[PDB]
Design an enzyme around this catalytic site. Structure first.
Site, short mmCIF file in Angstrom:
data_model
loop_
_atom_site.label_atom_id
_atom_site.label_comp_id
_atom_site.label_asym_id
_atom_site.label_seq_id
_atom_site.Cartn_x
_atom_site.Cartn_y
_atom_site.Cartn_z
CB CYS A 129 6.26 -2.96 10.05
SG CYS A 129 4.76 -1.97 10.00
CB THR A 152 -0.93 0.06 1.23
OG1 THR A 152 -0.16 -0.04 2.43
CG2 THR A 152 -1.95 -1.05 1.18
CB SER A 153 0.04 4.67 -1.27
OG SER A 153 0.21 4.38 -2.65
CG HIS A 188 5.24 -0.91 3.34
ND1 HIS A 188 4.27 -0.82 4.32
CD2 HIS A 188 4.68 -0.41 2.22
CE1 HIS A 188 3.18 -0.28 3.81
NE2 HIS A 188 3.40 -0.02 2.54
N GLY A 189 8.31 -2.46 6.01
CA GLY A 189 9.39 -3.31 6.48
C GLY A 189 8.96 -4.51 7.29
CL CL Z 1 3.61 -4.24 7.70
#
Ligand code: CL
Lengths: 4, 238
Positions: free
Chosen positions: B135, B34-35, B93-94
């Site tokens: 994350c 996701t953005s 993100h991560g």
């Molecule tokens: Cl995530």
């Protein structure tokens, strides 16, 4: 609120 | 001269150093990611914050896994002799030990290795700070109420190991909002670890998630300071  | 102490990093070099901000908001459709709405607020907040700290800020947007690696390698090959330190901010993100490029993952170790004491000689003995808003897993906090090559590195993680990290689409991430506020207020007064401790408290107390989904509602977060630094770090000198 959103999570990464 | 008089008695000399070496308890704090020499931060009076001609330049404070580089502050590389990798702002990944839009991801390739095929990844299914996701953005990251609100990340631009974070990127702008960080640019201004480090600008006031006198860092040479370079903002990079929507970079692929290849571009991230190439950027880091090129930056590590630069001459940092006149620079006091190095800062790299990753917004994406991560997962645990991973940050995402727009088209795929990048092991955090791969990025940081370019700056090892033996691989970036002009930064040896100088603080290398990695601020990571991403994350580190999928856990939710419910709340209640010769020198080592790995030395001189500091990882200011947005969340505890194995946990999600929160970002507000309008205000930006909880961690970055807090980090910037604390730096603006205490950078000319407190040592870095003390500033980050304030960040921990701000995130821990002033934020709680609101979601229409019960699974993600009323959740808390605590950042994670990881230090391999060998000296105290003050952004000011003289
Ligand atoms: Cl995530």
């Amino acid at each position: 609120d959103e999570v990464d | 001269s008089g008695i000399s102490l070496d308890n704090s990093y020499k931060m009076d070099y001609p330049e404070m150093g580089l502050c590389i901000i990798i702002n990944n908001k839009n991801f390739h459709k095929s990844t299914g990611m996701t953005s990251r709405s609100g990340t631009d607020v974070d990127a702008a907040n960080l640019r201004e914050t480090f600008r006031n700290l006198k860092y040479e800020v370079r903002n990079k947007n929507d970079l692929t896994r290849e571009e991230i690696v190439e950027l880091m390698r090129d930056v590590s090959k630069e001459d940092h002799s006149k620079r006091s330190s190095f800062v790299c901010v990753l917004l994406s993100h991560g997962e645990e030990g991973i940050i995402f490029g727009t088209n795929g993952p990048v092991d955090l170790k791969k990025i940081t290795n370019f700056f090892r004491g033996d691989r970036c000689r002009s930064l040896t003995g100088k603080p290398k700070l990695f601020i990571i808003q991403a994350c580190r897993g999928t856990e939710l906090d419910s709340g209640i109420e010769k020198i080592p090559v790995e030395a001189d590195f500091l990882y200011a993680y947005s969340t505890a190991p194995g946990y999600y990290s929160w970002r507000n689409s309008k205000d930006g991430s909880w961690f970055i909002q807090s980090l910037c506020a604390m730096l603006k207020q205490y950078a000319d007064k407190l040592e870095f670890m003390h500033i980050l401790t304030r960040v921990n408290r701000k995130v821990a107390t002033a934020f709680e998630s609101f979601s229409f989904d019960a699974t993600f509602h009323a959740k808390k977060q605590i950042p994670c300071i990881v230090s391999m630094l060998t000296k105290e770090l003050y952004f000011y000198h003289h």
